[PDB]
Nucleic acid binder design. Sequence first.
RNA 1: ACCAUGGUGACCACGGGUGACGGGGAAUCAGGGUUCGAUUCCGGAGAGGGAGCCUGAGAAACGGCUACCACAUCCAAGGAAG
RNA 2: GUAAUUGGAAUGAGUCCACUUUAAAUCCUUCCGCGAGGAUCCAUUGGAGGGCAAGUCUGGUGCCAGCAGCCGCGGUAAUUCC
Lengths: 57, 185, 131, 141
Amino acid sequence: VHGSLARAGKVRGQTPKVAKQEKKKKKTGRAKRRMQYNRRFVNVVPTFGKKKGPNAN
Amino acid sequence: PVARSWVCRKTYVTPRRPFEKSRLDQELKLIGEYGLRNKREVWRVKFTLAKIRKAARELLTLDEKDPRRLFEGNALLRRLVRIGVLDEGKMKLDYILGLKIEDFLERRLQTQVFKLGLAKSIHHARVLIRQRHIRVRKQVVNIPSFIVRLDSQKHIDFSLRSPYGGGRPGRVKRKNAKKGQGGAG
Amino acid sequence: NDTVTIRTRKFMTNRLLQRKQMVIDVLHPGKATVPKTEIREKLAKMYKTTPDVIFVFGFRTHFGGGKTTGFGMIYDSLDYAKKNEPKHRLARHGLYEKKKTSRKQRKERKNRMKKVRGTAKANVGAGKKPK
Amino acid sequence: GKCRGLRTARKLRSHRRDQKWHDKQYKKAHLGTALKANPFGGASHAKGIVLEKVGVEAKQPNSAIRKCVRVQLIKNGKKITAFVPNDGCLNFIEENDEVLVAGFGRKGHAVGDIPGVRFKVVKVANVSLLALYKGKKERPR
RNA sequence: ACCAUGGUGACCACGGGUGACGGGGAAUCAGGGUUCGAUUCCGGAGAGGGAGCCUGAGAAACGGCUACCACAUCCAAGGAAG
RNA sequence: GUAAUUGGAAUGAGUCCACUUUAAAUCCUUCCGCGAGGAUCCAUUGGAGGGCAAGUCUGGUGCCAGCAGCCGCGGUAAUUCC
């Protein structure tokens, strides 16, 4: 039907729950700006392609 | 009712529009190739650069033969000649207008302890300052934003209390030599 | 003793106050803040007087050791040292002892002596036996 | 068009102080009757108890049952409606709590697809409605 | 107190509102402005509400008093204090 | 740049005298000492369709729950919902 007052809190109330698995911490602070300038500009790679961006899948 | 100063102004400025792709890119290579911590202290020195141009163009809209820029622009120039962004014998109020923020991030303490051969790897040249290892002639200072003058520029050195200029090795050398003699007499 | 420099500057003696007052900068290069009681004899063995009329205070060590700076002064007498001097630096080394009441006491003692009128035997004696 | 001239500034000023009464977001800031009208009354937040849970319907292109409550303010006491704005968050507001109703994105007007609502709900019973959805707090006893 | 019939106004009087203390100023800024200012500086006012006073050089003071009206305290209920 | 192996004239927070400041004390300033290997001594807040920098990667839902300031995405493969 169209759900008058029932199934309120439905889609989070039935979702499969995936554990947040641990990682390394991020290099916070000054070193983030170190490593991401290093991510973008110190290696301007000659890979062409109309420049597919920074979350390529 | 109080004996307080009250007086403060903001030092950095935030941009007109954010999220244009030809701003953050041409500003990111300030944050990395000169080794800074956050973009607020890029806007800081740029807003410092900005009002000097706003000063000088209040001054360039005046003519020839009036006394106020004779006091102002000369006192303007005898303060940024001594900081080393602009050399002495070619003093004009017109060369200052074509000037870029690459020179204000060149006259810091932090990039001059990289290019005077005192260290390596510009981010590391941040680290030595703040970790209390670098003195001015008599004064030890842990400030990367210390725009060190042209006058006191040949005088940056390691401290007398530094490892690299003095002694009493700190807690990593003391700890390792202790445990080796900590198995017998 | 060992590696300590004592210097001073802006020496102004005066006989308005009959003192000798100056700015002292103490150089301890890699050492801690020097005791003031050690400083108030290292001028006496320079000004040829006794460590009895040389008073120092006010040392704030500059950033990262080396030159601290402060005040110091020299009186012309120990009896001048008890006339023209605020009582707190007269007492940091014992020359005038100070144990009084707190001001919370002294106010409320006067607030209860205020109600009682005329009785000289019972203005002070407004409850000194009960406490 | 305009009368103009150097000496006519009385005409050009008593023409502006009454042609200013014809644009709205000035007029709901100086005329007074639109200052009393809002339930918050020149404020930014209000506390109020929950009287009724209701489900309103979404507007013309959508079709959903948007959930709302029926807060009645203790300041200048009068009935309003209010929106409880998250996924599993109907359950965290219960009957006759004390919630802090805030504005809803657009000042004085409903956003999106909820016809006839003006306020949203944060801080159910001293704890933030974010801080119950995000698993940082509970509803205290 | 005796006389005279005047005065103000569309160059907005008079009346109403003010979520109005005024001013130095503050936020903002191409120029032009729009808003804020209870707030440490100076000037005004008032110590719950309105009135009346003594002393002093200066107070219609309120960490001075007396009366009323609104609020409240002790009590051995005879009275006291705000 | 991972996955590394060490290190050492590297150090700050933290715990600790003592001097100092101060009226008396506190910060802070100085200075024995201890004090970093997933340096566990750990950085969040908001977003990722367009305005607006950043994903048609996966699972769940199925005009429901919900998102969205505006346009819009939602009806069994969603670049916006969990």
